[PDB]
């Protein structure tokens, strides 16, 4: 079914089964590698990005693109495991609005990744296009001295690709603010665009 070729094929009156040349299970396996190993993986990745890139903002984008690579991928089978081989009962509801899908990061994205829950999902005071999630003690960047906050844009990239498939294009930033005795908690103050806010603003 090539782009150059047409949609042409042949009749159904034979059997191609199984011909899996490679098709397997896809279930939630558990192998649980050490945080030192993945921390070294992230470590030499950030070393490559400070090698090859000029200044602050382009490095921030050239970090968040990895999150945009695999955010779509984690979205669709995390939803296919949570809201649903595959002797399937059903697939449940999609994103209704913004407040179920940023509950869906809050419910089962962090507990898919980091075995806990980010502690709040605060709807903002002054506006509604801006939303803010704070992780309390970020797991994959706990060793980096976070005075530059440029090193946590893995996870701003990974949630932006959780919402760009969801139809909400969104400016996603991170800041870090020590509001509690919990130190080095990072706020992901996200935004949206006006238009799916106005698609929410048609009826709410």
């Amino acid at each position: 079914t090539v782009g150059p070729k047409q949609a042409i094929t042949s009749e159904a009156s034979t059997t191609y089964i199984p011909s899996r040349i490679y098709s397997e299970s896809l279930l939630f396996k558990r192998q649980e590698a050490s945080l030192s190993a993945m921390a070294f993986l992230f470590q030499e990745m950030i070393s490559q990005l400070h090698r090859t890139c000029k200044t602050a903002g382009d490095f921030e984008t050239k970090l968040s693109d990895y999150g945009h690579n695999i955010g779509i991928r984690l979205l669709e089978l995390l939803n296919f495991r949570a809201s649903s081989s595959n002797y399937i009962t059903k697939m449940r509801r999609r994103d209704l609005k913004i407040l179920d899908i940023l509950q869906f990061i809050h419910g089962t994205l962090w507990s898919y990744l980091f075995n806990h829950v980010s502690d709040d999902l605060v709807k903002s005071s002054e506006r509604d296009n801006e939303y803010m999630i704070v992780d309390n003690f970020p797991t994959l960047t706990q060793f980096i001295p976070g005075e530059n906050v440029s090193c946590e844009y893995f996870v701003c990239g990974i949630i932006k690709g959780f919402l760009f498939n969801a139809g909400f294009p969104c400016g996603v930033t991170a800041h870090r603010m020590p509001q509690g005795g919990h130190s080095q908690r990072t706020v992901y103050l996200i935004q949206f665009d006006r238009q799916v806010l106005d698609r929410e603003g048609l009826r709410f």
Partner: protein, 146 residues
């Protein structure tokens, strides 16, 4: 005489295929070109303004949706972005037969073949699939449910 499409977010067909019953032994001669993208392009229009509302609890599957003046169409919307469309029907009769549950056990069943190909990290979005194996799998997966 059955016609599969997977049509993307920026209108690109990431997988589109026909097949035929040998009891028809061909498919829609001289009708195979109007029953292509334009009908499917309007099908993208009706699933575009049918997905985002709750109401015209199974948000993914939608069943038979519309009808041009020779046949009728069915649909499916995934949260991956993609909108699966099968176009079925013998060209002589107006084919009424929407099985609605056993071909519901096709759309959630072809979904994982899209999943494992999406999980190929060399595979991008917005590019079609010349898998020699996943297209030979689906006709035999349609050998389950004709």
């Amino acid at each position: 005489p059955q016609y599969f499409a997977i049509i993307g977010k920026k209108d690109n067909p990431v997988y589109e295929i026909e097949f035929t019953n040998a009891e028809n032994p061909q498919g829609f001669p001289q009708d195979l070109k109007e029953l292509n993208p334009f009908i499917l392009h309007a099908s993208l229009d009706i699933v575009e303004d049918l997905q985002w509302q709750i109401n015209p609890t199974d948000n993914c599957y939608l069943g038979k949706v519309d009808h041009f003046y020779g046949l009728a169409i069915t649909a499916y919307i995934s949260y991956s972005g993609m909108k699966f469309v099968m176009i079925h029907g013998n060209s002589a009769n107006s084919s009424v037969v929407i099985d609605d549950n056993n071909m519901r056990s096709f759309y959630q069943e072809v979904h994982e073949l899209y999943v494992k190909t999406l999980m190929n990290p060399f595979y991008k979005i917005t590019d079609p699939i010349r898998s020699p194996a996943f297209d030979s799998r689906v006709r035999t997966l349609a050998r389950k449910h004709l």
